[PDB]
Subunit: 318 residues, 3 copies
């Protein structure tokens, strides 16, 4: 049991003095509303570590000494702090390598003959946009007049692409891939009582759907699902906004976002590195209404003076 780390800087970030002078770490794997985020805390002997390149690519490997290190991601430095008497730092770093916190704010609008989530990310984001090679494997028949009027281009994925017209979208910024949820890639795990430090296995019935109904064009109708993984309920009818042709099948989007809050674990673990936001967990060795699949929201790998606390949050993956 001995954690180690390899911070590949690919240049003159610091002259590999980060191996000597770390104090803590955090990580994330967030599909929702944010990217990943390194944190560093670096000593000073009255000034030894210069302010690094704000926009330097960092490659991070974690794991134990005497074991092969896991793929952890690649990062680019955005924000920097300092401290008082101990002279700390917080060299934080976000996901995208070729584009970090710059050159992503070129927006526009699309025409009617644009197949959505093909002509939005595969066919539109390759012409020097937010993050180029990310793709969506949804290729449904979409010939609706659709455009971003004026949205921030990382909120333009949210107001029209990957939250409202999601139908389960991930928009995970690292590794340049925004997929859907419910397990596009075959990765199971097994957890028990003899692995886990703590829990928060919550449940909500404020956010139970029983039906999901949407809105259509004015010349206004609705198409609904009738079993949101529950048979104990009869009727719930909720509406937020209108639509033209997008919510003809995007009632499946609200099947997720209310039932993702229906069951949510938050369990702490010592260091594995076998934990990502696209993998499902089989929480074995628990009580009656807990055992089952859970899609992992976020994994928070940390160093400290204590070790690893890889906090894993999840949603109800049915």
């Amino acid at each position: 049991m001995q954690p180690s780390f390899r911070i590949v800087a690919d240049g003159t970030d610091v002259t590999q003095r980060l191996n000597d002078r770390l104090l803590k770490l955090t990580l994330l794997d967030k599909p929702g509303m944010e990217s990943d985020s390194l944190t560093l805390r670096i000593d000073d002997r009255d000034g030894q570590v210069a302010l690094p390149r704000r926009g330097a690519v960092l490659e991070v490997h974690l794991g134990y000494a005497g074991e092969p290190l896991m793929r952890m991601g690649r990062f680019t430095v955005d924000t920097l702090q300092w401290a008082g008497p101990p002279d700390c730092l917080t060299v934080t770093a976000k996901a995208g390598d070729m584009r970090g916190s710059g050159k992503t704010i070129r927006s526009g609008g699309w025409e009617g003959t644009t197949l959505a989530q093909v002509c939005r990310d595969v066919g539109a984001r390759n012409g020097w946009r937010v993050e180029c090679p990310l793709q969506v494997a949804i290729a449904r028949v979409d010939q609706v007049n659709e455009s971003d009027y004026h949205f921030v281009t990382r909120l333009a994925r949210q107001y029209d692409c990957t939250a409202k017209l999601a139908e389960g979208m991930l928009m995970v910024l690292p590794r340049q891939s925004g997929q859907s949820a419910t397990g596009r890639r075959i990765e199971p795990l097994v957890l028990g009582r003899a692995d886990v430090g703590s829990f928060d296995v919550t449940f909500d019935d404020r956010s139970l759907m029983r039906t999901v109904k949407t809105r259509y064009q004015l010349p206004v109708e609705l198409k609904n699902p009738k079993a949101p993984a529950t048979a104990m309920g009869e009727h719930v009818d909720r509406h937020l906004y209108t639509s033209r042709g997008e919510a003809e099948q995007a009632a499946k989007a609200r099947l997720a976002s209310f039932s993702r809050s229906s069951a949510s674990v938050r369990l702490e673990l010592p260091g594995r590195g076998d934990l990502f936001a696209e993998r499902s967990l089989l929480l074995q060795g628990f009580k009656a209404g807990i055992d089952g699949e859970f899609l992992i929201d976020s994994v928070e790998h940390t160093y400290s003076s204590s070790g690893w606390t890889t906090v894993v949050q999840c949603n109800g993956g049915r």
Copy 2:
């Protein structure tokens, strides 16, 4: 001095093992924005308490052993949690018995010949709506074109019925009764120094009205009160939204909601159970500008390993 409790489950919630395995409690009596809320914390001897019926009616009685227990309310379980090493629970439960967190989201719109707060709750909520037998004793002449366009039916009480067109409304979800404030029922009390644990007797002059002026139909006028329980002020003119015929007398609504923040106590007590959100307090035994009536906002009855902390918050009841 010995607190006791009777949790009547009226079914197979748990087989009365809750009498053996509690750890804490909370309660509320909230007129504003929420219902009441039980909390429970229940042991596990590596799994003894199964996950209860999410929607089981619970009747709660509190008080001391050797005294008659007080009416505390009836509750239906919505949310459930867990914990780490000690294996806790939070079996929380909201107000309404026949309708808890389900089957309340059927909305609609009304016509012009609808007397407001009679044809809204007495004459509209009896046809299988949010919570059926709750009534409003305001029967004023209201022949205005009024309708909910699309509101959540518990926010439809707030955006159009019991906050904007309130004139003092309570909308207290337990016991199926949403009344007005300023004491429709004759219940006084007396408190002193020898009863109370702590205080927070706040005051605000950021939210002092001196007049209250509203808006009318376009073919726009205003009718105002000139003494919001103060004579030290001269002029304050505030407007938020327009109205058709509702704010002809709903300038009395803003007389409350700014002067409810004018004086607000928050005093802790040991266990009584004689404290509800509809009762006025006479805080005797205090300083000069404190003694007087106070309508109770919320009462928070708790168990612990310490005992009772019945936190009582109030507003300025003039």
Copy 3:
């Protein structure tokens, strides 16, 4: 080293018993969104200090005993609290003397021939408005149709005058003067390592502009700056709202509000009283990318049982 204080009440607030019975203090010097704020904490020997005049003018002097006291400001009491067993108070007080938390809510609209920030504060706020003698030294050619439709008159400075059409505005409520930033008055200082208790020297690249582009009238164009004190960037294009003639030069407003978050120190000091929101700091004796000018956001002078903690926050003053 002995802090002293002179609370000039100019009347029968308390009979100078505040010199005997204080416990703590806070102050502010906030240009943004708030005024200054005293706090007091006053003992009770079961009731000795009556509730003071809510609207009594207080003059505050601070500094050390044996030194001339500094100008700290004048204040008017608004909010009051109490406490539990120790019987505290929080006699808080805001900036304006002639107008505190009252008689400031008279609004209106202006015509086309109104030179902005002359006919808005110098030529409009002298007719019994929010705070009378405050002035703006910006006298640019503004013949645009401009009016407040219905804004709160302290938000009417924010939605149209000193945040959106700011171009660096301060709107500092004490001493009746709302100026622009970037040092209209010649006041430098020098700080080092041997003066300062702690730090938070943050940086942000989420809020870096590279260009700043605005919007115009419909018969829509843009005029932009191309160097927001950076040469490491190439293109950032951000838009929020349209304009008629105001954002012809108000692209300089967004040059500040994004680069004010680009560098932000927050350093604690023992008591000086030589620190105001309009003064620039020269943080000497530090590392490479820290040394330079910093416009002070806010100074927080406090008493305690420990002494002074004059927390000084700043922005990047280029």
